[PDB]
Amino acid sequence: PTIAHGDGRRPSKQRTFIVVKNCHKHHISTEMELSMLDLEILHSIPETP
Amino acid sequence: PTIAHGDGRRPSKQRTFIVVKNCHKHHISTEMELSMLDLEILHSIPETP
Fold first, then answer.
1. What CA–CA distances, in Å, run from B7 to B4, B10, B48?
2. Which among A5, A6, A13 is the nearest to B31, CB-wise?
3. Residue A43 backbone class (left: φ over 0; alpha: ψ -120 to 50; beta: rest)
4. Residue A4 and residue B29: Cα distance in Å, rounded?
5. In 3-state terms, what secondary structure has residue B48?
6. Cβ atoms A5, B27 nearer than 8 A
7. Gap between the terminal Cα atoms of chain A
8. Residue of A nearest to B29 (CA)
9. Are B28 and A4 an interchain contact pair (Cβ–Cβ within 8 Å)?
10. How far is CA B24 from CA A6, A9, B28, in A?
11. List of residues 6+ apart from B13 with CB closer than 8 A
12. What is each CA distance from A22 to A16, A19, A25, A43, B36, in whole angstroms?
């Protein structure tokens, strides 16, 4: 908006500002290790304690 | 008003003051701009959505 003033200065027309805001994408990585012998007995079901 | 005194000083009379004040004027002006196309098609009826 504007103000009207009695002063001799020119009045200024209606004005709008159009503003663009942009994203930021961030990337996150973690790592895990698993033993082969550990993965071995998982499939079978145990019989002896 | 005044207050009487016993002294030999000459008396000041009844005192009257008349003060005149007048208006002051202010003018206020805004300017707006309207495009041709808006004001034209306002009269036009909607044929299609």
1. 9, 9, 101
2. A13
3. alpha
4. 6
5. coil
6. no
7. 82
8. A4
9. yes
10. 13, 21, 14
11. none
12. 20, 10, 10, 49, 34
B33 contacts A13 by C-beta, under 8 angstroms: yes
The helix or strand, by DSSP H or E, that contains position B41, with its residue range, turns out to be helix B36-43
Token reading at B18: 């008349």
Solved with: cryo-EM
Whether the CB of A34 is below 8 Å from some CB of chain B: the reply is no
Which resolution in angstroms does this entry have? 4.4
Identify the three-state secondary structure at position A6. Answer: coil
Both tokens of A20, joined, read 């663009």
B2 neighbors B15 (Cβ within 8 angstroms)? yes
Tokens of A32: 């895990």
- The residue written with tokens 């000041």 in the block is B12
Q: In chain A, positions 5-24, which contact chain B (CB-CB < 8 Å)?
A: 5-6, 10-14
State which amino acid sits at residue B2: T
